[PDB]
XYZ file of C-alpha atoms in Angstrom:
106
model
C -3.336 25.131 -22.608
C -6.346 26.260 -20.321
C -8.433 24.108 -18.284
C -9.041 21.802 -21.464
C -5.139 20.817 -21.122
C -5.607 19.308 -17.562
C -7.737 17.206 -19.267
C -5.202 16.455 -21.718
C -2.624 15.157 -18.980
C -5.347 12.918 -17.823
C -6.359 11.803 -21.384
C -2.669 10.190 -22.266
C -3.280 8.808 -18.894
C -6.136 6.500 -19.669
C -4.520 6.022 -22.853
C -1.625 4.232 -21.595
C -3.157 2.027 -19.000
C -5.760 1.067 -21.591
C -2.394 0.374 -23.829
C 0.160 -0.270 -20.954
C 1.132 -3.563 -23.029
C 2.559 -4.674 -19.498
C 1.770 -3.872 -16.098
C 5.167 -1.897 -16.134
C 3.522 1.124 -18.096
C 0.520 0.893 -15.866
C 2.357 2.077 -12.847
C 3.824 4.878 -15.078
C 0.354 6.129 -16.074
C -0.994 5.898 -12.730
C 2.130 7.931 -11.316
C 1.360 10.681 -13.753
C -2.479 10.944 -12.639
C -0.831 11.144 -9.175
C 0.400 14.834 -10.505
C -2.646 15.283 -12.813
C -4.835 14.336 -9.972
C -4.069 16.747 -7.448
C -3.421 19.196 -10.074
C -7.052 19.129 -10.728
C -7.455 19.984 -6.997
C -6.704 23.427 -8.344
C -7.620 22.925 -12.214
C -10.918 20.973 -12.600
C -13.884 21.593 -14.625
C -15.526 23.771 -11.658
C -12.218 25.206 -10.802
C -13.959 25.048 -6.962
C -13.029 28.570 -6.292
C -15.579 30.117 -9.196
C -14.800 33.455 -7.275
C -13.929 33.423 -3.909
C -16.124 31.299 -1.631
C -13.752 31.057 1.499
C -10.032 30.004 0.359
C -9.245 27.537 3.209
C -11.994 25.152 2.607
C -10.088 24.764 -0.648
C -7.733 21.822 0.506
C -11.119 20.539 2.256
C -12.189 20.060 -1.604
C -9.035 17.889 -1.995
C -10.951 15.796 0.449
C -13.525 15.057 -2.140
C -10.838 14.380 -4.711
C -8.757 12.645 -2.134
C -11.561 10.032 -2.466
C -11.689 9.595 -6.044
C -8.007 9.811 -6.544
C -7.574 7.621 -3.566
C -8.745 4.519 -5.723
C -6.791 5.505 -8.710
C -3.535 5.313 -6.954
C -4.874 2.019 -5.610
C -5.020 0.787 -9.000
C -1.158 1.562 -8.998
C -0.890 -0.660 -5.854
C -2.911 -3.376 -7.670
C -0.851 -3.293 -10.826
C 2.306 -4.072 -8.813
C 0.388 -6.819 -7.904
C 0.109 -7.764 -11.410
C -3.418 -6.418 -12.260
C -3.109 -5.633 -16.042
C -6.833 -6.004 -16.917
C -8.196 -5.150 -13.486
C -6.048 -1.960 -13.094
C -7.401 -1.042 -16.630
C -11.009 -1.761 -15.787
C -10.386 0.468 -12.748
C -9.297 3.138 -15.415
C -12.822 3.199 -16.909
C -14.090 4.220 -13.444
C -12.007 7.252 -13.500
C -13.377 8.200 -16.854
C -17.113 7.531 -15.704
C -16.395 8.949 -12.336
C -16.353 12.496 -13.757
C -19.081 11.839 -16.078
C -21.324 10.058 -13.518
C -20.579 12.762 -11.053
C -21.972 15.092 -13.507
C -19.052 15.789 -15.566
C -17.204 15.792 -12.188
C -18.670 19.021 -10.676
C -18.973 21.544 -13.302
């Protein structure tokens, strides 16, 4: 279960919001992304630290993920307001986010 697995956690995530059936399972999946989100902070395609850049500037890298991860949970906020389709659309934003970013930053 190497880096390829972190992607798996994130995989089933888009899967459920896409198939949440109800705004209820949407909040659930997004709550997992919260976990899989910052977890990627220390487990992302570029693993940020590819050797030993500095070590403290790492949480700052969270600042970058904090942005993309910020609108994800905001979808969690919306789904609570009944944004089933809209929250799902925000889902394809996370998918292309990484690819558009150039496979995130790898």
